[PDB]
Amino acid sequence: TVFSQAQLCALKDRFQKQKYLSLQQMQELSSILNLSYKQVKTWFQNQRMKCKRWQ
């Protein structure tokens, strides 16, 4: 239920390139990292909610 440091890098890496992923893309990314899609899905949302200028 808690992301490893490498996983955080990988998610943070993509978010810097893409604030908005498609459902197919979030499924693809959750497979690589071995995390639930819901987990990946929530992560991006939480991430976007922190700043106005990422919305």
Swiss-Prot record:
Disulfide-bonded cysteines: none
Source organism superkingdom: Eukaryota
Region described as Required for DNA-binding: 23-52
Effect of residue 41 to A: Decreased protein stability
Effect upon mutating residue 42 to I: Slightly reduced affinity for DNA
Record's subcellular location: Nucleus
Gene null: resulting phenotype: Loss of pluripotency in both ICM and ES cells and differentiated into extraembryonic (parietal and visceral) endoderm lineage.
Coiled-coil ranges from the UniProt annotation: none
Residue span of region Sufficient for interaction with SALL4: 1-55
Effect of residue 49 to A: Increased protein expression. No effect on protein stability
Tissue: Not expressed in oocytes and spermatogonia (at protein level). Not expressed in many somatic organs, ovary, testis, fibroblast and hematopoietic cell lines.
Effect in UniProt of substituting residue 38 to E: Reduced affinity for DNA
DNA-binding region: 1-55
Effect of residue 45 to A: Increased protein expression. No effect on protein stability
Description of what induces expression: By the transcription factor POU5F1 in ES cells that acts as a direct biphasic regulator: a steady-state concentration of POU5F1 up-regulated its expression, while an elevated concentration of POU5F1 down-regulated its expression. Up-regulated by the transcription factor FOXD3. Up-regulated in ES cells by transcription factors T (Brachyury) and STAT3. Down-regulated by p53 in response to DNA damage induced by ultraviolet light (UV) or doxorubicin. Down-regulated upon ES differentiation by mediating autorepression through interaction with ZNF281/ZFP281.
Functional note: Transcription regulator involved in inner cell mass and embryonic stem (ES) cells proliferation and self-renewal. Imposes pluripotency on ES cells and prevents their differentiation towards extraembryonic endoderm and trophectoderm lineages. Blocks bone morphogenetic protein-induced mesoderm differentiation of ES cells by physically interacting with SMAD1 and interfering with the recruitment of coactivators to the active SMAD transcriptional complexes. Acts as a transcriptional activator or repressor.
Quaternary state and interactors: Interacts with SMAD1. Interacts with SALL4. Interacts with ZNF281/ZFP281. Interacts with PCGF1. Interacts with ESRRB; reciprocally modulates their transcriptional activities. Interacts with NSD2.
Family assignment from sequence similarity: Belongs to the Nanog homeobox family.
Extra facts: 'Nanog' is derived from 'Tir nan Og' the mythologic Celtic land of the ever young.
Name of the molecule in the record: Homeobox protein NANOG
Organism encoding this protein: Mus musculus
Gene: Nanog
Full-protein interval shown: 101 to 155 of 305
